[PDB]
């Protein structure tokens, strides 16, 4: 009969602005209710939890969150979204007076503020005398995405994010190839839309 | 460390008994396995709250437990399936919730062994183009034809091992869509400023610990056995 729903299994917030993750359960009587965080390839990390005490609960690193009886609700709030909250959160429940169960889970996508776009595919050589490559897409802000490739020899990947911290500089980027010599980097992102003002070198 | 899990990674053949044990030093009544799954959360196998009392999580079928001490709870895949590949997690609980989790197994099923295969890596160097255009410059690693998806990916630079600049993708993809038995593959991206790209003292490697077979497992083919091991690319920096 008691349940933790949490929806969207992957969700996006922008750099710096706030942070919301929801959680509501089905217990009649109020639960305990508890925030872990997941980084990849790693273990599990409570962040808060309701314990029937303050209603108002307060984390680490900023996060809060607010057990509501009467909306059945425990979001998970941070006030700045930051590079590093990139994670996969989980709400849990006490049930049966004998165990936690689990949501289904929701990754947090931090959207990097590109203020100076100046988005490019590049071709990238083998390190070692094969004449293989590869495409680099990279430099797009938040509006662009990468649609998958519609030939099965034409491989590319997602969208992702690094974060230079030389330089305090963030970057979008994917990658595509192919086994085909002929497949060209000017063809290689034909199935995504792509800035009108891309660089194309030659 | 309280609670300890072991194996920390495993790879079996199908129709395999498979062990998976949990310790604790702290004595709680209460310990669980559970299993994840991506976009399942962490489902309950069985649970147990004293020497021989056990119960029936949600996903029991396929599996058994035993509890032999206070400290442990060992959990039996009775015939291993491929839908056993999962991250397996313990946990020991005190009488108010207070969970703690074991670090986690990874456990792949596979049909057959004979398709397991360690990844080709290349590196790849940076454009003149984005060098001229951005004074940055991306190196790009791809890890190709791998079986099972089981891989973990590094950047090496001069000798340690380096985090920032970096984006590595969160799946390998299938090579062959089509096929129950696709390989894989997975790139990553290493961005330094053209500069230290530009210096030909400077040492860049891509590093991918593969998991696969053991000592112990036997092999029929000609192709080399695909034992785990450590795969690496590697390239200098240059100024032309």
């Known amino acids: 009969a008691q349940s933790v729903t949490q929806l969207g299994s992957h969700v996006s917030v922008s750099e710096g602005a706030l942070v919301l993750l929801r959680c509501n359960y089905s217990?009649?009587?109020?639960?305990?209710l508890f925030w872990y965080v997941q980084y990849p390839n790693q273990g599990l990390q409570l962040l808060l939890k309701y314990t029937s005490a303050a209603t108002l609960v307060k984390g680490i690193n900023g996060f809060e969150a607010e057990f509501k009886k009467s909306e059945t609700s425990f979001h998970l709030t941070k006030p700045s979204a930051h590079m590093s909250d990139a994670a996969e959160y989980f709400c849990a429940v006490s049930e049966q007076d004998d165990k936690i169960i689990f949501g289904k889970g929701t990754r947090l996508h931090i959207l990097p503020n590109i203020q100076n776009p100046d988005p490019a595919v590049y071709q990238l050589r083998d390190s070692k005398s094969s004449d293989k490559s590869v495409c680099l897409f990279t430099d797009f802000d938040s509006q662009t995405n990468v649609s998958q490739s519609k030939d099965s020899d034409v491989y590319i990947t997602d969208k992702c994010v690094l974060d230079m911290r030389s330089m305090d500089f963030k970057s979008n980027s994917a990658v595509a190839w192919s086994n085909k010599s002929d497949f060209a980097c000017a063809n290689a992102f034909n199935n995504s839309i792509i800035p009108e003002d891309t660089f194309f070198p030659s | 460390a309280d609670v300890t899990q072991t194996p920390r990674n495993r790879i079996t053949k199908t129709g395999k008994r498979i062990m998976l044990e949990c310790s604790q030093t702290?004595?709680?009544?209460?310990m669980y396995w559970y299993r994840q799954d991506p976009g399942l959360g962490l489902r309950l196998i069985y649970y147990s709250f004293d020497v021989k009392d056990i119960n029936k999580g949600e996903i029991s079928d396929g599996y058994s437990v035993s509890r032999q001490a206070q400290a442990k709870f060992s959990l039996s895949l009775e015939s291993a399936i491929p839908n056993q590949t999962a991250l397996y997690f313990c946990?020991?609980?005190?009488?108010?919730?207070?969970?703690?989790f074991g670090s986690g197994t990874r456990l792949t099923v596979v049909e057959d062994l004979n398709k397991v295969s360690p990844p080709e890596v290349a590196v790849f160097e940076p454009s003149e183009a984005e060098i001229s255009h951005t004074q940055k410059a991306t190196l790009v690693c791809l890890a190709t034809g791998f079986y099972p998806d089981h891989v973990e990916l590094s950047w090496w630079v001069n000798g340690k091992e380096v985090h920032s600049g970096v984006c590595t993708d969160p799946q390998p993809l299938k090579e062959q869509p089509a096929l129950n038995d696709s390989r894989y593959s997975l790139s990553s991206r290493l961005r330094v400023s053209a500069t230290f790209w530009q210096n030909p003292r400077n040492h860049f490697r891509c590093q991918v610990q593969f998991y696969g077979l053991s000592e112990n497992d036997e092999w029929t083919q000609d192709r080399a056995k695909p034992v785990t091991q450590i795969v690496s690319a590697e390239a200098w920096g240059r100024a032309d």
């Open positions: 946990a020991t609980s005190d009488e108010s919730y207070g969970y703690t």
């Open positions: 702290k004595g709680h009544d209460r």
């Open positions: 217990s009649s009587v109020p639960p305990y």
